[PDB]
Design a protein around this ligand. Sequence first.
Ligand SMILES: O=C(O)Cc1ccc(O)cc1
Ligand SMILES: [Cl-]
Length: 290
Amino acid sequence: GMTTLRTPDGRSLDVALDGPADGVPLLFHHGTPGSAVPVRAMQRAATARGLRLVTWSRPGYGSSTRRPGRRVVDDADDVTAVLDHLRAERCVVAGWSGGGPHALAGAVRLPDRVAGVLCIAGVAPWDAEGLDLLAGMGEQNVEEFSLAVAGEEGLRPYLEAEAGGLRDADPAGVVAGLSSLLPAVDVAALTDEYGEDMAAGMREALRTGVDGWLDDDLAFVRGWGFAPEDVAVPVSLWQGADDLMVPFAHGRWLAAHLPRVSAHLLEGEGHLSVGLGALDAMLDELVATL
Ligand SMILES: O=C(O)Cc1ccc(O)cc1
Ligand SMILES: [Cl-]
């Protein structure tokens, strides 16, 4: 259930902490936008493997104190604070989408505590050599990233206009709000329990405004503060060919730059469907790093 953790710099983090109380932590880094609202399918898959699912809202999402100017790597301060709260020597970590860079960061910060990374449709570094980051992206994401590069003053009112349609959205509302970004396989994923969980995640992400979404976007268009080459632990990398939010080429790029990577490039899968259908295979590979 939900708890609050005070960090050393005086911030509060909203933390969703599952049992089992003695399990190895699985730290799940949420997407952009996203929050500490667990996906029930991920809870069931984690508990089946004896993993203790832990997620926190990144600064500015939900009731987590905004931390303006944060880089991707600054999230690893909170990884360390959370694992110290749990008294956990070792963990595995997973990140989806905007969570992918943050999951990798924790591995670089804590190379002897993080055993392995699961990176699901993770976004590539903004200066990724030889990659056109915006190529294959849905036009909503091209617009958002172009505003992010231009700065907070133009990005904020854009995100506030998008948030109008998403802050109270049910699953149908999330589909309507992401029109350019979802292929049919992703729309089909946002039904039933997964859709309810993702919509609840989106509502909590936007409950106190767009600050977490804004600060994530601004972080993704600057230096992460580390390179994928610095991630020494095994990475299980997954990417859908039909993803319009993080194009296939981003996962191909990350797979080429990570030193120890199992790469899975799934035909017919999008940004949402990749995680939903492959969760058992993803967690089997992650747990094998322990
Ligand atoms: O792409 C992401 O990182 C964010 C996202 C969040 C909720 C959702 O329903 C779809 C996408
Ligand atoms: Cl285990």
